Design a binder for these strands. Structure first.
Ligand code: AGS
Lengths: 422, 95, 85, 326
DNA sequence: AAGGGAAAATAAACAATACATAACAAAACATATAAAAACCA
């Protein structure tokens, strides 16, 4: 028995989370998997349960604001004695150091020290720990996730307070590594095109009718006393069209819709009239220009000098020109798609001396622009970035695509498409 | 004798004066121009770092300093009842 | 053979981002999860070469093969002629 | 592929090489060498004058410059500048770049102690604070009276440790300071690959040629070629038991009966019987145990008959015959 | 002007070498505490 909440599209999943969670510890299963990709509101639908259940007690941890397991143990032990202070303030406490723990023994060593002074409680109370984002921990491995499963059983089972877990993770290839533990899973499905728009309208009406960019445009135009419902319609006409002209570009996201709205909204506001408030279809026909462009990209003619420009134009030549062909076709007498090959030194100046307008011999400034180009990360080393100077075995390679080469060819009037021949 | 040990220290004009009155006088014009762009770069970051009150107020402000030489130093306002600190991250310190 | 918006280059990347983190593709030589801690810590210090080639040339391989797509994609969709070669 | 090889060369021992090498490098072109050294001596006042402008002076050229730098830095310049400012003369801190054991921490720990410890700079010593500690050194030095207090020398700037990139940028920030004069030399043909327009902005390098075609005595020591195994196991046989000489002599005969490759080798069974024939090998174990000593110092090989063969050349084994075995 | 014919190019099988990364070692960088050792007093 529990007081379930109600939400928009989790009607099955609210039932199971009301099923798999009770305030009684015996009915409560130990470990749990909430799985789904980002863009399902699992952090939404979990907390939305918890606000409707003030009877239980939740301790909220956040792995994504941590970096490793060694603070993650320090994250747990600092918080439970922080929470149990605010739940039973009459109970005296030998407060321990949460900085002291760094190893997975030390947690259950300290939880053996924490819970024993809390033994005098009246009934078996549970205590739900919540980890949010267990796959995106940036030092994860295989033998961390099971390491947190068996933590319950190393605890004494007869204590008045029982710690149980709920794990939030993503990337369901990861969950397939641990199906043999058979812990109860509640998968969260992705969304469909209507329920994306249905979620988005009931979540963004509260800001886009109350933004001052509307409220300025209210008093700036001749304001007819349009209702909030009249503000609701144009907001709804905005949302029901923006998901229609962009759904193929964004997929079934919610986060990627929550910001593209907040980029194209004031540019939509300026192109309204006093009269198009009653005229929605012609309003889209006047504000058309934003609905067919992305506007997420905030093609350079590159800063580098002339001899460095020809230094780049010789380096792109060994993306296709092998040593078997080059010395014949460049006498002094297609892999456009493919990944670039590997240079060595002085093959550059082999090609550089050929393609330059006897007119040049001094190569001090030519050697200057090489490590200038190395700091630009346009030509990088194959090996580590340390010993590449003294000629040991060091291979070089470009990192510029074909188009920026093509503009920079014509920027110095040099022709390159002749020498690329499939 | 000792050259295989590394880094051993040891403790062992009528015309030119007319250069000397010219050289430094020129160099006073140099470095005074150098602090001008130094005051220029320090100014245009400082006003633009502040006074930008966005409405969402859940976003960091980013600044792209295009064409910059990776050595551009910055000073900050005092702006009391709040500490304002500077952190620099080298790519050498980015493992 | 017939009105379909062909998209640009600068936008497919935003769709290409979700496809690799939907695990429909993999990187070519990427050991995914190390077994224990000190083998993973030995992979963290190692600076990589695949990031040093740009985004559009990381040699992505396949998770779901072409022939199996014909069995799941219904014939009502217009691209059903493209499942088979 | 009939190639003449360095193994097929009349080789030269240790004392024979270095002595006749010392004869050439001190008597080959002696008269024109100091004749060059007197010609370039008149450039020495020109270097003194430009170096007051804080110019990082860099010397390129063929041949070793190590002797020339130490004459120019120590004897000529360092007391000349102390006399021209008005007491111990200006401290010279050389950096042997050909010595690979140069680090960035140790030489800079010398530098801040060579430079003035006017403040508690150990407070800013904290975790890489080296660029941090030198930055606090720079801005203070912008508002000091302009005089050189230190001249540093960096021999062989393309050396095996100095050419590392985190060390190179460390020297770059030193050179912008007006109080120190930076007189260095390199030898590489790709030395201007080391610097971009960022570092040379901090450096303001100028260049001068010095080509005296010196032999690089000190700079040859750390370097090695196959002069510096056929020569390795040439010394172990000179200190062993007397029986190992005989069982290697019987080894080397039938292994040269047929370059010294695999095919001239011998089977283990008959070689046991052969070294049983001259009352030498008792059995397989007593043979193999004093054959593992030839194995442990990599003096013989085995591939598959059960062929043990010596990895030295045809010419080498008869040299091992007539000299050390006999 | 024709033409021979050797240089250059192509292809394919095979061998030899280089490369990216995994696994690890070791040195620099960092902290902690009981025992020695100065050291006032
Ligand atoms: N039924 C719903 N009713 C209202 N809003 C919803 C509903 N489902 C999802 N949302 C919204 O979807 C947003 C997505 O929140 P998140 O929980 O971060 O998404 P996510 O899939 O959990 O990605 P994360 O944070 O990486 S786990 C929430 O902030 C809600 O505003």
């Amino acid at each position: 028995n529990v007081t379930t909440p109600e939400v928009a599209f989790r009607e099955y999943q609210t039932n199971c989370l009301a099923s798999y969670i009770s305030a009684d510890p015996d009915i409560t299963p130990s470990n749990l998997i909430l799985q789904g990709y980002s863009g399902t509101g699992k952090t939404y639908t979990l907390k939305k349960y918890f606000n409707a259940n003030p009877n239980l007690h939740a301790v909220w941890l956040e792995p994504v604001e941590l970096v490793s397991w060694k603070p993650l143990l320090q994250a747990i032990a600092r918080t439970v004695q922080y929470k149990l202070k605010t739940l039973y303030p009459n109970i005296p406490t030998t407060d321990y150091d949460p900085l002291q723990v760094e190893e997975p023994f030390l947690l259950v060593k300290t939880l053996h020290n924490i819970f024993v002074q809390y033994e005098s409680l009246q009934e078996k109370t549970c205590l739900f720990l919540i980890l949010d984002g267990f796959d995106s921990l940036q030092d994860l491995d295989a033998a961390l996730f099971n390491k947190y499963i068996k933590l319950n059983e190393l605890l004494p089972k007869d204590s008045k307070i029982n710690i149980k877990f709920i794990y939030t993770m993503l990337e369901t290839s990861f969950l397939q590594r641990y199906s043999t533990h058979c812990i109860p899973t509640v998968m969260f499905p992705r969304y469909n095109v209507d329920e994306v728009s249905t979620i988005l309208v009931m979540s963004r009406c509260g800001e886009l009718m109350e933004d001052s960019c509307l409220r300025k445009r209210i008093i700036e135009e001749q304001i007819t006393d349009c209702t909030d419902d009249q503000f609701q319609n144009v907001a709804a006409n905005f949302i029901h069209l923006i998901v229609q002209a962009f759904h193929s570009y964004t997929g079934n996201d919610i986060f990627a819709l929550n910001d593209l709205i907040d980029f194209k909204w004031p540019k939509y506001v300026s192109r309204i009239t006093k009269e198009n408030i009653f005229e929605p279809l012609a309003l889209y026909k006047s504000a058309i220009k934003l609905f067919l462009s992305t506007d997420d990209n905030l093609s350079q003619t590159y800063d580098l000098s002339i001899i460095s420009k020809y230094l780049l134009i010789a380096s792109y030549i060994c993306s296709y020109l092998e040593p078997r062909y080059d010395a014949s076709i460049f006498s002094r007498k297609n892999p456009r798609y493919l990944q670039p090959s590997l240079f060595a030194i002085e093959r550059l100046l082999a090609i550089f001396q050929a393609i330059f307008p006897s007119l040049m011999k001094a190569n001090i400034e030519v050697f200057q622009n090489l490590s200038e180009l190395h700091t630009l990360k346009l030509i990088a080393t194959t090996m580590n970035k340390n010993i590449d100077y003294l000629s040991p075995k060091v291979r070089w390679k470009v990192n510029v695509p074909w188009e920026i080469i093509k503009e920079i060819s014509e920027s110095v009037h040099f022709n390159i498409s002749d020498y690329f021949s499939d | 004798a000792d050259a295989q040990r590394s880094h051993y220290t040891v403790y062992p004009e009528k015309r030119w004066e007319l250069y000397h009155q010219l050289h430094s006088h020129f160099h006073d014009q140099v470095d005074h121009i150098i602090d001008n762009i130094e005051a220029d770069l320090k100014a245009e970051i400082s006003d633009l770092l502040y006074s930008e009150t966005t409405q969402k107020r859940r976003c960091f402000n980013t600044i792209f300093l295009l064409g910059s030489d990776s050595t551009t130093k910055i000073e900050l306002k005092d702006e009391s009842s709040r500490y304002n600190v500077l952190i620099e991250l080298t790519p050498k310190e980015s493992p | 053979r017939i009105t379909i918006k062909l998209w640009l280059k600068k936008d497919v990347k935003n769709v290409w981002e979700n496809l690799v983190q939907l695990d429909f593709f993999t990187e070519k030589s990427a050991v995914g999860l190390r077994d224990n801690a000190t083998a993973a810590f030995y992979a963290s210090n190692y600076q990589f070469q695949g990031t040093m080639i740009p985004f559009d040339l990381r040699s992505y391989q396949m998770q779901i093969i072409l022939q199996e797509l014909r069995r799941i994609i219904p014939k009502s969709n217009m691209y059903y002629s493209w499942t088979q070669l | 592929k009939s190639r003449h090889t360095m193994s097929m060369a009349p080789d030269v021992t240790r004392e024979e090489f270095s002595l006749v090498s010392n004869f050439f490098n001190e008597n080959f072109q002696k008269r024109p060498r100091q004749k060059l050294f007197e010609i370039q001596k008149k450039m020495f006042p020109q270097y003194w004058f430009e170096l007051t402008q804080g110019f990082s002076l860099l010397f390129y050229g063929v041949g070793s410059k190590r002797n020339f730098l130490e004459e120019f830095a120590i004897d000529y310049l360092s007391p000349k500048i102390a006399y021209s400012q008005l007491v111990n003369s200006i401290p010279c801190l050389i950096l042997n770049g050909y010595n690979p054991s140069c680090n960035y921490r140790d030489v800079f720990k010398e530098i801040t102690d060579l430079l003035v410890p006017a403040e508690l700079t150990r407070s800013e010593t904290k975790g890489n604070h080296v660029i941090l500690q030198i930055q606090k050194m720079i801005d203070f030095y912008k508002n000091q009276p302009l005089d050189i207090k230190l001249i540093l020398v960096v021999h062989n700037l393309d050396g095996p440790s100095i050419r590392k990139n985190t060390f190179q940028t460390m020297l770059s920030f030193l050179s912008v300071i007006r109080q120190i004069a930076i007189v260095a030399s390199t030898d590489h043909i790709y030395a201007p690959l080391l610097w971009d327009n960022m570092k040379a902005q901090n450096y303001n390098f100028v260049f001068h040629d010095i080509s005296n075609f010196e032999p690089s005595t000190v700079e040859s020591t750390f370097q090695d070629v196959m002069k510096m195994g056929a020569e390795g196991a040439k010394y172990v046989l000179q200190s062993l038991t007397v029986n190992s000489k005989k069982m290697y002599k019987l080894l080397i005969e039938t292994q040269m009966q047929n370059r010294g490759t695999q095919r001239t080798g011998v089977e283990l069974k008959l070689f046991n019987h052969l070294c049983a024939a001259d009352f030498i090998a008792s059995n397989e174990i007593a043979l193999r145990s004093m054959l593992r000593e030839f194995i442990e110092h990599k003096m013989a090989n085995i591939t598959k008959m059960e062929i043990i063969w010596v990895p030295y050349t045809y010419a080498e084994l008869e040299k091992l015959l007539k000299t050390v075995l006999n």
